[PDB]
From Swiss-Prot, chain B:
Annotated protein name in UniProt: L-amino-acid oxidase 4
Catalytic activity: an L-alpha-amino acid + O2 + H2O = a 2-oxocarboxylate + H2O2 + NH4(+); L-lysine + O2 + H2O = 6-amino-2-oxohexanoate + H2O2 + NH4(+); L-glutamate + O2 + H2O = H2O2 + 2-oxoglutarate + NH4(+); L-arginine + O2 + H2O = 5-guanidino-2-oxopentanoate + H2O2 + NH4(+)
Gene3D superfamilies, per database record: 1.10.10.1620, 3.90.660.10, FAD/NAD(P)-binding domain
Organism listed in the record: Hebeloma cylindrosporum
Binding residue positions for L-glutamine: 60, 389
Gene Ontology molecular function, alphabetical: L-amino-acid oxidase activity
Amino acid sequence: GERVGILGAGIGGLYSALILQSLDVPFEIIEASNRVGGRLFTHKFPNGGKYDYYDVGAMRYPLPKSDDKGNYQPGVMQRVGQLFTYLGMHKQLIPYYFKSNKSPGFQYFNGVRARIGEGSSFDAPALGINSSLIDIGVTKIVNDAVGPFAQALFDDLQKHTTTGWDDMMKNDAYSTRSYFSFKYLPSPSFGLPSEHFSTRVINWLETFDKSTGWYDRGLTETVLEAIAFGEVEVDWRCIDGGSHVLPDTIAAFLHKKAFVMNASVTAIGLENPNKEDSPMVVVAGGQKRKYSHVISTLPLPVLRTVDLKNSKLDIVQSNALRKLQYGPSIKIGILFKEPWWTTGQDKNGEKFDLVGGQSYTDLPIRTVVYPSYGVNTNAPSNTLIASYCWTNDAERMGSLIGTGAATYEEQLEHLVLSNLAAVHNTDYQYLKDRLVDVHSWDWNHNPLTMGAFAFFGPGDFQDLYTSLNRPAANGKLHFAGEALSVRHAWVVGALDSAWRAVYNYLYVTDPAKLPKFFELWGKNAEWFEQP
Amino acid sequence: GERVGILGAGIGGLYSALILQSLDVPFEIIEASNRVGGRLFTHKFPNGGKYDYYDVGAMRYPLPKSDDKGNYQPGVMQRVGQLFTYLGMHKQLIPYYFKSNKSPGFQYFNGVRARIGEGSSFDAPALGINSSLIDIGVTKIVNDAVGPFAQALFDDLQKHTTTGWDDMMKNDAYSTRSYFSFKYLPSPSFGLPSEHFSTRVINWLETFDKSTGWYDRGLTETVLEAIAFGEVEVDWRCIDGGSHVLPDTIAAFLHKKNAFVMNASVTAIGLENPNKEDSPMVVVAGGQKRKYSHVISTLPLPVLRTVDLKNSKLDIVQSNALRKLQYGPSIKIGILFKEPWWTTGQDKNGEKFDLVGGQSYTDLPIRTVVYPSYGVNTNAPSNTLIASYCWTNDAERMGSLIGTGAATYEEQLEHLVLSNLAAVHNTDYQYLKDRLVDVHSWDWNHNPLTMGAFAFFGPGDFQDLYTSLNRPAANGKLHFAGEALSVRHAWVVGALDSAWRAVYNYLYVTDPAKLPKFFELWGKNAEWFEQP
Ligand SMILES: Cc1cc2c(cc1C)N(C[C@H](O)[C@H](O)[C@H](O)COP(=O)(O)OP(=O)(O)OC[C@H]1O[C@@H](n3cnc4c(N)ncnc43)[C@H](O)[C@@H]1O)c1[nH]c(=O)[nH]c(=O)c1N2
Ligand SMILES: Cc1cc2c(cc1C)N(C[C@H](O)[C@H](O)[C@H](O)COP(=O)(O)OP(=O)(O)OC[C@H]1O[C@@H](n3cnc4c(N)ncnc43)[C@H](O)[C@@H]1O)c1[nH]c(=O)[nH]c(=O)c1N2
Ligand SMILES: N[C@@H](CCC(=O)O)C(=O)O
Ligand SMILES: N[C@@H](CCC(=O)O)C(=O)O
């Protein structure tokens, strides 16, 4: 009969399983490792307390507003909020402070230190940035360029249209950089010369807006991220105890109602590609398993290591698996003896007075994230995310992570602490005396992810994205995972991909279940609807 | 008292040392590791014979023509050739077969297998590539777009001008992709619509021209790379015994004149007193302070970002350049087999591969296969294959399976590579597994000593930030060098050019009376052509 093989016990595969279970469709989940959650990965420090953990992957959720009952207003990540409520986790959501809840975080650029909001220029005039651009500020400039695209895409979601996406796709051959260099012109109200920005100005924008190399990726990703971050209000939330609680709770729910763990997939294909009723065959852990349909949540680079002969990918799908671009990321968590960023003071006696929030710098660590969990408890977290990098910053830092050599582990620690000391204006020894343990992770050096997440280059969305939204293997192989969405690097992207995969499965096997599917999980993947 | 501190015992630092030694300038070389050569790295398989090695980094040199005495004609890499001759290595250079010296290498794209030169379309019509584009071919299309820039830069070198570079810089904000999408129009002789290529066509070009993601990097690098590869004749050469022979020979030459400080990683560089005009330079390496009059750094830009450069007084552009000037990734996988099956073997249908040197290409994860040119005419030909050589996105993805320290992922890596090799050559997996002996793999983007394979600039890097690092720092006493400080990124000549410029600036400010001899031995210019 019908039994769906779900590849990958990440949040996308677990979500697919929730849907199928609610519709009484048999399924199995095949997972290569001994754990569920995938890129929801919470590391707990052995020497710490209840809140001495940090999330190596997902950690913050910009959700729509919600009522006391867990009903979420329409929004980009309503689907995530409704999942929490569905699992009885709404009351386990705690505030995530994107900015500090007390004094503002630090900025350290070009050797100039300041607090967020103090209006420092960070020596930009010495870089050749004229005073008019400095007065306007990076945020307003980028918003003026991204705004028109973002507003059109938000109108698509609110009004149930796709013309905004059509407009984004006519511009999808642009990177953010090439859009500034060859098309964008400043709003006349800025009083700037009606000229395209120079590379010097564009790189100044990237320095404070995103990460080194971000602007060489697709303009569309810049637009989609502004929408995801709510720059188009949102309740920033994290999960009490770490993001691991979400997949662990789903797994425990599915258990009491199967899982095939420690079985890496090496082949996917039809048993007989010339038979219309041929089942699907998945080789996992050296054993053949048969299914009617297969929903894959494996990252695209991982699928490139799987034998997909007899899955009958069309020529566009196979090229898309290779070309659709992924991005890197690293994180470094440090257990300290105390939350010095909250209770301590700098070398001149000035209190940091930081609670949650983030600090930013052009030094290699780039971004520091102070924990929001546990701040209002008897045992606040002593664990800091000392570095969180993207693109070029993550690529370079990755060479110092996971070397297995004590000499490089020591170099890494000294670099991170030194960068931290310069950002916060402390001595190196002040932080070394308080260090307990270090944990680091490079998602671009992990066979299970082969990159942090999808981060498409120019042209990817307009040319190759749609091919993987079609099924393969005579309609019996469905591609899913966060890469199959317009919310890359977000949990909602994985949830959206699972919605589409199950939709196509029901469409071809049992369309009579579509009304119930719509009723429980939404009439659309992205188009807004009330709770 | 002059004494130059050279940071890094790679080919750039060793070359700097050769120059200074020829000019009687005292120097010391500080090296973090226990070896010299840097990205010239030859791996020898212990279970193999004389030619069972492979070069993990540099392996092939497109040199100018040369005479019997080792004099090289003017060209992009004359400087490399003259270095070989200077060291008495000219007769140790052997042919490098860029294409196979017997039957052509393989191409395997979109499930279609063919030999190089057979004119296959690899199912391109099913991708939406119209027949006119296929008939013209990727090579002609890319040459038509790159040609004008490459010709102007080659004229700069021949006629001793910089207008070609100035024109290239006017277009440096383009990536190769954005140039095709928003500016390039086909030559009217192509008979194509006078319109910019679609993304589908541009990605088709990238698939057969370079590597996944190459076209999102700077257009200038694509132009400069075509000049370096000679696509604008060249004698492709490699070094008998491996590229390691070059830095080893330099080291042995310098010792009998020692000034090597090994196992001393640099952690700080700066003036002893930044407010004193006569302040010496201080280098902290291996936990020890060392003082010099001037410092020539050949450390990669990402490595300098891990060094305390306070008191080197970089200007705001230089410090940003260290962060933003982009590097690119690369991996290599070498496999020792029991026999050179690519030369003596046959596919599942009995057709002999008949490959000697050369390369095969595929859109499969391994991307490029390189058959050895060394040893092909000896009693013990090489049994060692470069089963995979990747760039950009292909190298980034493959890197996650390299250096994991887990046997399970070493096995997955081996099975993937062998499976890809079998599909490219039309053999069974077991045919290659039965012949496998040993595997060695390397990811230059997961290596603290390089932090990337080499400079691979994005759009705007050359026009905006490159020049800042061509100026010295630390009151004129810190000189930035290494292959990143050149227009020949990812080439030995780039490192040599950077050393020429660094020593030139050093001599210019400390002892200009040595310039004539410097010009006489090492060239009147870094890049502008001259006769041997
Ligand atoms: C550093 C970092 C930071 C963030 C985020 C990611 C990262 C890397 N994200 C994004 C979010 O973590 C991500 O989009 C989803 O967790 C992806 O879920 P999937 O199910 O698509 O894949 P995921 O990769 O999580 O799951 C795939 C599963 O397949 C398994 N697998 C792999 N190869 C296999 C094989 N051969 N056979 C069988 N199984 C195999 C894996 O082990 C894994 O269990 C995020 N999101 C968010 O909402 N907020 C945030 O703040 C962040 N931040
Ligand atoms: C995979 C691959 C393939 C190729 C090539 C590179 C790579 C990575 N190249 C390019 C060529 O290898 C490269 O451009 C030069 O070797 C670079 O020499 P440098 O001296 O500039 O740096 P390189 O990196 O070689 O040397 C720097 C030195 O500094 C040391 N160091 C690092 N950190 C330090 C610290 N903190 N303190 C002290 N010392 C430190 C390093 O250990 C090293 O000895 C090439 N070229 C070519 O001509 N033909 C080819 O075919 C190829 N192919
Ligand atoms: N969404 C993740 C990853 C970055 C991104 O969204 O692009 C974050 O909040 O950091
Ligand atoms: N030069 C090296 C690296 C690639 C490049 O030059 O860009 C090679 O021949 O493979």
